[PDB]
């Protein structure tokens, strides 16, 4: 018998999918899949001091 | 000899305040005195007469 525990919607961590990466496009209506975070919008250069 | 201080933690509710650069500047405990409970309900640091 094999058991396994999962956890979702947390800090971006490892143990993820095998999908290939792509490039970045800005100022264009596009879909994104940034390490689990999913949505659509327009990506632009920010200036927030993280 | 040396010197060191020790405290202990408890489950509480705080009202953290972020500045325009994303750094915590002030906080208010919500179970310290009657005045502090008013601030948490109003979600403001300034209370008008009433
Ligand atoms: C926020 O950061 C900018 C640039 O680092 C600085 O000019 C400004 O004074 C900061 N504001 C603060 C510390 O309240």
UniProtKB/Swiss-Prot annotation, chain A:
- The domain of life for this entry's organism is Viruses
Region Disordered: list its residue ranges. Answer: 10-32
Oligomer status and interactors: Binds to host ACE2. RBD also interacts with the N-linked glycan on 'Asn-90' of ACE2. Cleavage of S generates a polybasic C-terminal sequence on S1 that binds to host Neuropilin-1 (NRP1) and Neuropilin-2 (NRP2) receptors. Interacts with host integrin alpha-5/beta-1 (ITGA5:ITGB1) and with ACE2 in complex with integrin alpha-5/beta-1 (ITGA5:ITGB1). May interact via cytoplasmic c-terminus with M protein. May interact (via N-terminus) with host bilirubin and biliverdin, thereby preventing antibody binding to the SARS-CoV-2 spike NTD via an allosteric mechanism.
Q: What does this protein do?
A: Attaches the virion to the cell membrane by interacting with host receptor, initiating the infection. The major receptor is host ACE2. When S2/S2' has been cleaved, binding to the receptor triggers direct fusion at the cell membrane. When S2/S2' has not been cleaved, binding to the receptor results in internalization of the virus by endocytosis using host TFRC and GRM2 and leading to fusion of the virion membrane with the host endosomal membrane. Alternatively, may use NRP1/NRP2 and integrin as entry receptors.
Q: What is this protein called?
A: Spike protein S1
Source species of the chain: Severe acute respiratory syndrome coronavirus 2
Q: Which part of the complete protein is shown?
A: 510 to 559 of 1273
């Amino acid at each position: 018998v094999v058991v396994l525990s999962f956890e979702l919607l947390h800090a971006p961590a490892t143990v993820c999918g095998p999908k290939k990466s792509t490039n970045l496009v800005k100022n264009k209506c596009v879909n994104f899949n940034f390490n689990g975070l999913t949505g659509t919008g327009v990506l632009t250069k920010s200036n927030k001091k993280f | 000899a040396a010197d060191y201080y020790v405290g202990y933690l408890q489950p509480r509710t705080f009202l953290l305040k972020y500045n325009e650069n994303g750094t915590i500047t002030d906080a208010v405990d919500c179970a310290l005195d009657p005045l502090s409970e008013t601030k948490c309900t109003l979600k403001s640091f300034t209370v008008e007469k009433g």
